[PDB]
Amino acid sequence: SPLAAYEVDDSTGYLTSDVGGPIQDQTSLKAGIRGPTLLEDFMFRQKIQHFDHERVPERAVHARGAGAHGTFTSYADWSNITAASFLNATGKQTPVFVRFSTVAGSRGSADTARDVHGFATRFYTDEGNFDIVGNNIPVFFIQDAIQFPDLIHSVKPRPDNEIPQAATAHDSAWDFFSQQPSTMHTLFWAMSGHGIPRSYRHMDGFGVHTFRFVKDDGSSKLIKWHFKSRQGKASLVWEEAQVLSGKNADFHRQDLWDAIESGNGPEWDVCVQIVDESQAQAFGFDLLDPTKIIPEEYAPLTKLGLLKLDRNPTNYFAETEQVMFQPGHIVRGIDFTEDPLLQGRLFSYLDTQLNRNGGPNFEQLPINMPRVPIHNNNRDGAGQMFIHRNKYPYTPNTLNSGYPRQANQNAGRGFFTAPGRTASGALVREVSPTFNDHWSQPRLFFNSLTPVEQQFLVNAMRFEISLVKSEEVKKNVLTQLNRVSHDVAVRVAAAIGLGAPDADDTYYHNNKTAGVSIVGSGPLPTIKTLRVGILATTSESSALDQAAQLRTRLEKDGLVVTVVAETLREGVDQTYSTADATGFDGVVVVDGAAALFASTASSPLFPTGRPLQIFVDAYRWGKPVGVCGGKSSEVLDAADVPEDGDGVYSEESVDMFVEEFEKGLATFRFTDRFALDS
Amino acid sequence: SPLAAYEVDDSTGYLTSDVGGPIQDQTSLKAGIRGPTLLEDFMFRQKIQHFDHERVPERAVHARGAGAHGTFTSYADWSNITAASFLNATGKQTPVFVRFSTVAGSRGSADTARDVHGFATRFYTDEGNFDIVGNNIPVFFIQDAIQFPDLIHSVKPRPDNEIPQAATAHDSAWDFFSQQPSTMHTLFWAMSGHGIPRSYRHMDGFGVHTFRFVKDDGSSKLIKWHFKSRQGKASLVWEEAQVLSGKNADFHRQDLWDAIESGNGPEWDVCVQIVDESQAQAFGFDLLDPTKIIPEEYAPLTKLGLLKLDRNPTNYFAETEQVMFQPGHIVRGIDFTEDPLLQGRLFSYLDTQLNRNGGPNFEQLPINMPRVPIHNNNRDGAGQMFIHRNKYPYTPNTLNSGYPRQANQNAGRGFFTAPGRTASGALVREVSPTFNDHWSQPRLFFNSLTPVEQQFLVNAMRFEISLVKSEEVKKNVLTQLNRVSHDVAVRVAAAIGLGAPDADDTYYHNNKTAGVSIVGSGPLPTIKTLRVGILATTSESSALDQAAQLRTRLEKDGLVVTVVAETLREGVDQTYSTADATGFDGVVVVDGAAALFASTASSPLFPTGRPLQIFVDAYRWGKPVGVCGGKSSEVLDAADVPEDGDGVYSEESVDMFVEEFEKGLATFRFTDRFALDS
Amino acid sequence: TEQVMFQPGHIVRGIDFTEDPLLQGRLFSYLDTQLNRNGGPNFEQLPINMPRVPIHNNNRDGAGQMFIHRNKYPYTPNTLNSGYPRQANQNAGRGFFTAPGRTASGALVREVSPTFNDHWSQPRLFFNSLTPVEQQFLVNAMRFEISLVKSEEVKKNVLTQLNRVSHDVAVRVAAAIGLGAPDADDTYYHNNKTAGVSIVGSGPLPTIKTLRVGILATTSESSALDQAAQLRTRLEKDGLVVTVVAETLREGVDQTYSTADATGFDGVVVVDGAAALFASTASSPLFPTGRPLQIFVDAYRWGKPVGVCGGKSSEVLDAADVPEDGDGVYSEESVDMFVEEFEKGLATFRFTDRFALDS
């Protein structure tokens, strides 16, 4: 913790200026008790000036996000495939910092927007900082970095009025998607449940690009990075995400914070797919193309180590806001590929930190510093924090005895470009013909989802495209969807009253791939941290008694339990007024409370119908719901919830109720409650 | 447009660099067709560098906002009270730019957060730019500018985890409120409907501070600025505001945008209260105190002129984002007072623009430029756009013949300090004792609300304080509330399971004041722009017929009509999937659509129960609802809405339906549907 | 050095400001200007600017933020951080406080105090307090600068102001620029003087340590370099910085004639073994024509102590047109006697009898 050396404690002591002079900061200096404020009030000005300059530009993308500290532990000595020092011994531990994010919204936008999500991991290795700046979706919208402002301008708010915030549901985005068909693969992922994850802990991370692992002998293999969640994969449903955006814009950052504080810090297996250089085009697409995945059937995952997040930042601004990641932060044993999206990224991340930091010495901020000595001839610049002793900062020199020395493949453990890499041909601004198949892999992805997942994706597209005003853009969108799947274009067209174009089967096929479905990936492996809302009443002393007994039983198994009542008191966490179904992964009514759910309910302490609305919403959104007490039928009738439904629980016995209700939590969503196209 | 001279047209022509060289920007230059990108690719780098640097720091407060162009027109020659040139002739027109905003949220946060709102107006006068940087609430939280960072730190997200976004519902804010009693007045306004306005058009603006009008003879009078909405006052209900925050984060900016495009540009009467210098302490409080209003019974409003917003910006960034308001932008005829809040603001706004603009020449941005010539000896600085001819930029000079000439009270129409102003006494960092009554005016305000408005305010406080984790903070909050009103403290305490402290009647009184109530300000004066959702179906050709007839008669009265059905087609604006009750001011079901409202209604095209939920939500939130066509009983029964309810409409005849329904839209909210504490 | 950011706003308990209107505005400027230099608000965190005591305040964020603040309730007043940091003032925490006797009275004005209006008496006090040669130098600095002003009207306006200080100054300055001085205006003329403002009159320097002595020698003569080495040891003993100069470097020789100039020395000594370099027909590809003699002559003309060490002085001094009996001109055979006299000269520092006076 270079973070702990820079920590500042203010738990005792008298207020000082920034130069250590004790002062006051509550009243301005004035000429007389009702007089004007004086220019000589240095206390006033130092304080306001600091306030007035507190903000810094938000990131150009991924502005909305949150971070945590942890550790990476290697499972083996990986010398045989990479020279990377953080992977060179069983059990070797490296500190990490991770930031998760959306792409499109500004700071302050809602966590539960539909979007691609960032998953950026810094490894503070003993041979330098290494960053993997990935996303929760393994493919990207575009095939060349020069198009990135085009993609981003199209998805961000229309620039006359700056509407809409954090959403692709507008003409410009679908105009771009429909004119730039490379977008189809990422679009399909973003329109699935991968666009609205349950939490940062319930998504995967991917490096997206093919990279190289380079051995000390100089041989190389091609790799893709996969961070596979140990919490399982899980999504919201859209109608739930929308309400969550309003009720709790901070949902994902709160979830992450709380999991870490409770001792449930999330984990991922850090994995690679590893293939030979000769396989760059063996799989029916080009490994230089970031719109393509390698099916796991062609290349299995190898598990390199464990990533665990287990500590929250001390100061959000200083750590999370100021962390400045770069794919250029590379270490010996890793190399780039000629992926034209990766290639341009290298430029952008060094440049953009000048905007954020306002000066060139951004690598000296505590969160950006390495954990090894720095020896170089970089000097001066605004905000220079070091006092360099070497007064001959040039190479070659004799007056500093030739130091710092050059590092390279054979000296000082230098980074070196993989020596088998070559280039040949004309200097061109031309797209490789090997990149031209934009529709096959979207179809592979779509084929690999379950029927209800396919319906959710169609429904997401129906939602967004129905909000596009241009009839031409809508037609063009159907044209592109039709090339992936005639069925998708037909079902989407039905919602927007246009006809789909005739089937064009060039890229149609029936193939599937493992591991891309959320709903298909079986029950969650753990239910720790999941949220249960127990709906109770201060009316009946039996209701708070039953709530307390359920609480014990659920908290035993690591669930986070919230007892809801009309008013706060001992045992009650939340009022009906502040409660919502978006707040819980499952809801239980204690039978003691059945009168609150009648249609003539009414209280000055919460909005009309709130108790029942929580229960109904939770049911309609596919959550496990139940009534505990043995007079269940009255609440279930008021809800129009069938007692015999999957994921509906009714028991008098607390112990039997809990046992089945917990199986429901693992199932997580009951997908039989959602209507499917015929 | 004033700013037409700076417009750039890209409706034709070939892509160029910033220096006019024709280029391409879709493919990177590579060493071979699958090769690495080249450093000599200047096309790539100039485009990506611009992208990398697009963002600028958000405003330190009022980051989330929106703007429009307009005109101010004077109603008279106001020479007899002020020298101000924009007020010197009946009918005199001056261009304006207004930005509206929330206070606490970052720039992507929801418009319908509970907050104080900004209302900042620039008058581009023939004697310089004059800015009135106001709020929609006439009193401010604190009495000294030096305390602003304390207020804002406490209300903004907790700095460890940056939670929660755009909300005072957390411990730090209520800690500050309870330890700093000056906050009570603004707190009561923010917890009333004024904290969740229906639109920027349905709120007032206030300068907050006492200022001075100064005549050409040097005599002065004390003024408060009031911008009084011609659209009337209106608020959301909290439970509505919360869902709206998710469903449409852009609600207020969209409402303003749309009103201007439809030729319904909003208007305010720009008014002043005018009192003599001798009345600074005549009204039982100190006019230098920004936590106090002057009750209209003691000083009436004088209408000075009309503010009309009628033109949307061309580019949001360039106009809205870059507008840099200053209370320091003052003109001859106006002066400051020794209000210690105002005094410190004068420093802050000049300083903070350096952060935003990144250099000192921010007054040269098109939106910030004046509409008259500039003559001064300000020179150089980053981003200097002028080429100054005068090569002797010093005073006094002979080598530029003594130009520019000094302007003052007697020459060149210079600004001048009101010459009757004086100071006397010790140089002190002390609060005037005349500022010490923090509680009477909060009580005056509370007393001037209707019973249901009082309930809504109590309920806002119950909501927020129930989320405060510290029992000590909650206790301290009740202590302060109790000094305003024992009844308030009792009613709030009931939701959080504490007892309120014994009554302390030092500041209790029964006085009321006119015009601070929303509910009490009679029906809206116009219903133009209000939104009616018509819930129809494609399953019956008669329903769409009914909807079309309803649309014709409602549009004739300038309402914005959305017809909602399962799918889009001619006549249908929105699908049930995208529709929500938060999108309408009133909801009509056409009786041809009754089958969608049954509890077994289901479709793959929208979430279960969505048609009925829209109707139920609208009813519960106090909106006029109805069924048109004659067969009303299944819809009203399914919704549990009584046919004889106020603001419930049931007529066979479209004519009669609309005549009654329109009375309901003017009534706006039916307050009898909300329960009151006994 | 480049990053140090000073401010008169950096004040401590026991010091306070006055209502000097120049000082009052400075307090604003120095806080504001560091934003320009540093490009962000955390300039007090640069090592040179940090205090040597703990910092406890609620300043947060900003570009370049180096601290990680633990207090997550950075507002006052608070209970959630127990009311810390506490307010410091006259009576608690050794706070800064404004001197309590200070007051203000009267109108809010943009007017100059009439008490500020005598612009000329003190300039005259200062001028009166200089020695005659110092007065001449001041006049000569004005004649130099004003003679480069192209505007005839500006020049007249200058003599109008100077004349209000001293008619004599305006006359002597006017003579160089071909204008007539305006007639005497004696409102602010006086004969008063004040101690300690004169440089020339502040006696010999109190130390000559660090002053620079150039020894002009030659590689022609093994004698010349021996004399230079003996001089060097004797001068270095008294903490002077000695530079031996010759045609080319070698052991004992610090600088070539090519790089040397009289501006590099406070005193110049020629060793008499080097006399041949000082002739008018001296010439070498290793230095500009006349360079050795020019160093000596420049040093003499600029008022420095000069001398010849070894016993044979008259060829050098005649080549240079320097009278052997001049004040601050030294001739001795003995190194010890040479240095004893020469060091008196270094303490005198400048021999002002070598500069002409008006009238």
Ligand code: HDD
């Ligand atoms: C040519 C520009 C460009 C391209 C093609 C990309 N990005 Fe990027 N990205 C940026 C330019 C950039 C940036 C403007 O440089 C950002 C904003 C702030 C920063 O540090 O870098 C950024 C931020 C950024 C962040 C946030 C890091 C954080 O939390 O601070 C993530 C996770 C990604 N990007 C991930 C990706 C992935 C997985 C991409 C494709 C595979 C990708 N970006 C393509």
Ligand code: HDD
């Ligand atoms: C001492 C500091 C301070 C104090 C006491 C206040 N403000 Fe302020 N205000 C600022 C410091 C500031 C600022 C940091 O200087 C901002 C942020 C951006 C800007 O241009 O100025 C600002 C912005 C800002 C804006 C946004 C203008 C726009 O849309 O760009 C409004 C409407 C206000 N303020 C209104 C007020 C009112 C009505 C106040 C009390 C009566 C008030 N402020 C007190």
Ligand SMILES: [Ca+2]
């Ligand atoms: Ca658009």
Ligand SMILES: [Ca+2]
């Ligand atoms: Ca800058």
Ligand SMILES: [Ca+2]
């Ligand atoms: Ca808090």
